[model samples]
Target chain A: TEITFKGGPIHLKGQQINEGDFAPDFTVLDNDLNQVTLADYAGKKKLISVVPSIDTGVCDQQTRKFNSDASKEEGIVLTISADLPFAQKRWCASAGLDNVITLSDHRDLSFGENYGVVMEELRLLARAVFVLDADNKVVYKEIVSEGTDFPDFDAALAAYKNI
Target chain B: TEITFKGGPIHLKGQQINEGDFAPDFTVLDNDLNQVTLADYAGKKKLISVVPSIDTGVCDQQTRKFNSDASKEEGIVLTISADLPFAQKRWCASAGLDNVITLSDHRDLSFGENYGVVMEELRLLARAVFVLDADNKVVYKEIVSEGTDFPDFDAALAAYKNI
Candidate 1:
């Protein structure tokens, strides 16, 4: 699957997850350099927030929005990006966003590839979101289509509630 | 080559560059996502500052030290790291660091592998420094045996003056 990066078509690697498909397992690095895999969130609902880079304006806003909204919900919110773990840790600390778990695909693009969000030209994860059920199945998936804009929060929350 | 990460053994990729060796060319990303190659500094003396991540305490100090010292010198100072260009831009902007050019080895570890600074376990660049003459020949090289400690700045500056 591919998306437009500022109006230009950008190719993406890996297979895209659908609303009813099983979410593929991926390994990413947390802020403490700990390995976090999809299996780690098993038996719990999840909101996987994907962003190109957390330092960008849109990504920053998107993550903050989710950090506020997802905390009230009943699921694990994971924000994955290509930023280094140190960068992610600093950003989260500065932003006071303690609700969401930030993970880095810096060492390897495993999550970026497995979730079909890798922006080929820019080497970033495309702006997107995924809602997974407790059964580890993808209950809601949104690829934003445009890299600059934010994902559908209301729709994602609705899906999460339904799941 | 191998270096210690906080006193623990960590293997690195690529052969270590030594003084008098012709500097190898590697591509990295600028803040604007432009490709920056080693040859871009051809005909100018260069100080390549390698860091694990600029967002950290010691890396921040290392970069600030070089930024202050390089402004008085007549050479290019390049700071290389695994941080995304976005994070590098944010740090430089926040720190008001204008003397040094920051580059990202995030997409590909070309610079990390070519310079033999990649910390295999941490997936970061081991703290190191490399100085090259105007002809792109290595004039001074120091791989800080410990990742937490700062490099030999006085020796690097002395070598820069002599070059």
Candidate 2:
């Protein structure tokens, strides 16, 4: 099927993600009830780490690993999932995690559909990682085919390091 | 670790649930952006048909089966999951499934957490089914332990009929 975005199929990763491609401007309420957006990290390397939920082992590991590596980056790292703001907040606190910001696509599926990470079959976000450069162009992307598997962390990091 | 609900422990052939149980009344937004609370159906019998997503083969099968059977009952068989309302409506439309009501608990972990169906480690709602009586009493409940397994349909139907 030909999916049009931004009314046009702009290239994203290997496919066409139009400018209006559901890359919705999402604001996840942080632990403090403040909203955070994708644009907050603009002008620096932005890594949008998409996971199902941090409560899961694999997704938790992915988020923790990203938190560790993200601290060394020149930009911000956002972990997107469907977890409740409270749960997300608690999970991070319990893990003593702070480097990466955990945001929710929970209010709606806006972030999921826009990012093409909505696992249609699972009704959860796909295990993927998207890296955006200062210009907001897709510098790196990885969508795990299996809902249970983890994404390639090294590749995503390499893309950021090179930029 | 044991969180209690309202009233006392009501026994069932499978599992037991009580009243004031803090049934995680999830907030699902309609296409018009109105919130639908799960507790809104408490006055009537509710066949909580939980699924991963109707986009998958098994989920589609389960939803369709319940849709057909629900028409015979005076109760509402709500299909709950993390799927977006838009995607859920599209799936129901394509399948001509009108007997069932669909709602997403993606906004928070209230439903899954309170019900003990939240796959804490996986961050996914496990495939489960619960038959609540006219008074919001859970007479039957099945939590599919494995991701590959399906909920017990016939048993759920029998309980529904009895109610």
Candidate 3:
């Protein structure tokens, strides 16, 4: 809940989440309109990137950065946002970055609500990153203190690689 | 609009509606991240065109048809969908469409739910049409019999013209 956009405080929904917590599996829409959940990637290391809007500047940069890392890492990279699956698919095709998979939280915001990253006022997800091990335990997490800034990508990748 | 996917009967959320019934106003998001309500177009005849997904073939054609008709009509034309506002905005800008206003029901789906058009299985709206006079009475209504088929555009246009 400690998030700020343009130096002003913002509110979030759901409970506070932290590293070492057992991550909850949530449903979100894949680019093909299929319902996808955390369980689908069982036994795989995961790097989850959360953004408010995928088409915007910061989110775009974050996605590209993570996608580059995904190409070199052994984990599944996912970028989740409130954007529609269609838009995400279009962007993915346009950007030509297949390493990072995009998911849509627009349907129910279940992933945002369960992760306690829902930006209540904007009805979006606050900027955040989470790295989970094969057992579905949160190994590293960073809910961006500044909504418009980038997440700690270096730390997330390191944690992801270590796991 | 009544909707069933792939020639099978489907369930919808909300109350069964009829012509002459008082239409309820609900909030949906606009392109600029603003909450827009039916009351925002108060004192004007409204033709609400609800679709499942704007990027799909039928939905795109339906929206273009309404947009073209709106250019010569006397009512406020709206295309409502589960697509995100950003997607709608981008599509509108790309297509150079200004006559039709696009709204996103992705956040709460209040408009879809209250209008009894939410396709319960897909979390999307069932293809439908609603024409309301200035007093907000439902003058014309159609729940498209088939989910993917085109609506009675001529009938809906006639109702809009009569209003």
Measured against the true structure, the TM-scores of the candidates, in listed sequence, are 0.94, 0.48, 0.89
What local lDDT score does residue B68 receive in model 2, on the 0 to 100 scale?
Answer: 74
In order, candidate lDDTs are: 0.86, 0.64, 0.85
DockQ, all models: 0.78, 0.04, 0.47
Candidate 1: tens digits of C-alpha lDDT, residues A1-163: 7679999999988777788898888889989888989878767898888999999999998888777776445577888998998889999888776546899997778988887888888788889989988888888889988888889999887887777
The collision pairs in model 2 are A6-A20, A6-A21, A22-A114, A56-B121, B6-B19, B6-B20, B6-B21
Off by over 4 Å in 1: A71-73, B71-73
As a whole number from 0 to 100, the lDDT of residue A142 in candidate 3 is: 91
Ranking by lDDT: 1, 3, 2
Docking class of 2: incorrect
- Interface RMS deviation of candidate 1: 1.2
How would you encode candidate 3's per-residue C-alpha lDDT over A1-163 as one tens digit per residue? 6678779788989767789898987999998888999888987888899998887779999999887875444568889998878788877876787546899988788999899999887778999999898898999999999898888888888898889
Measure candidate 2: CA RMSD.
14.1
- Candidate 3 lDDT at A47 equals 89
CA displacement after TM-score superposition, residue A76 of candidate 1 (Å): 2.0
Clashing pairs in 1: none
Best by the TM-score measure: 1
Highest-lDDT candidate:
1
Consecutive 10-residue window with the lowest summed lDDT within model 3 chain A:
A66-75
Candidate 2: deviation at residue A25, Å?
Answer: 3.5
Clashes of each: 0, 7, 5
Candidate 3 lDDT tens digits, B32-105:
87899987998889889999888777999999997787544466888999887877887787678675689999
